Structure formats: C-alpha cells, structure tokens
Design a protein around this ligand. Structure first.
Ligand SMILES: *[C@@H]1O[C@H](CO)[C@@H](O)[C@H](O)[C@H]1NC(C)=O
Ligand SMILES: *[C@@H]1O[C@H](CO)[C@@H](O)[C@H](O)[C@H]1NC(C)=O
Lengths: 50, 48
C-alpha cells in the first residue's frame, strides 16, 4: 500500500481483525503497522490554495 | 476459503432467539479449498 502523509498517534479503538481504515473516497485513512501491530493514523500533508 | 464469524452473548431468555442486534466479529479464515454441500452438528451425550 503506497501513499503520502503524516503518520500520527490515534484514538480509534480498532478491533483485533481490523487492519486499515477507509474514508468516503476509499482512500486509506489509518493503517496498522506490521511487526509492532500499533495503529497509525494517516493524515494528508498540509496543502491549500495560493 | 472457509470464513467463520463468531459472537458470544450473555442472555437470560428461556426458549427462543432473543430480539436484538449484535454484529458478528470474524473468528477465523481457513484455507481448506474443499467442496462443501452438507454439514453436521456434533453433540455430547451425558451418561450416569
Ligand atoms: C514480527 O511481526 C509479528 C507480526 O506478524 C510480531 O508478532 C512480532 O513481534 C514481530 N517481531 C519483531 C522482531 O519485530
Ligand atoms: C460440489 O458437490 C456438489 C454435490 O456433490 C456438486 O453438484 C458440485 O458440482 C460440486 N462442485 C465442485 C466444484 O466439484
């Protein structure tokens, strides 16, 4: 799974089976990292209009 | 793939299925790769 973003701590109580998370657009919003099993939230990097 | 979903519920109703909602979490995924059309429940006798 490829992508760009800032990986941050999260407070989403994932169930054991649950690995990643998806938004309305179906782009991944959270992921469970292998090896350490922790749940990292994926927040798109800051952007906006000039 | 044999998907088994399970849910364990504490109840106190006597005879029938209780009326309510409970979403079943996935228990196990088994790569068995076999044809299944018939199934059997296994019970246990009590002897005295
Ligand atoms: C390797 O990944 C598994 C998860 O598949 C985990 O249980 C284990 O602790 C990891 N080991 C190391 C050394 O990171
Ligand atoms: C599985 O078994 C049923 C009944 O024996 C049969 O009708 C069906 O064609 C079988 N499927 C495969 C893929 O063998």
């Amino acid at each position: 799974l490829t992508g760009t973003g800032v990986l941050t701590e999260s407070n989403k109580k994932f169930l054991p089976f649950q690995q990643f998370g998806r938004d309305i657009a179906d782009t991944t919003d959270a992921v469970r990292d292998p090896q350490t099993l922790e749940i990292l939230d994926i927040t798109p990097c800051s952007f906006g209009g000039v | 793939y044999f998907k088994i979903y399970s849910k364990h519920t504490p109840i106190n109703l006597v005879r029938d299925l209780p009326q309510g909602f409970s979403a079943l979490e996935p228990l196990v995924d088994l790569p068995i790769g076999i044809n299944i059309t018939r199934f059997q429940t296994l019970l246990a006798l009590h002897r005295s």
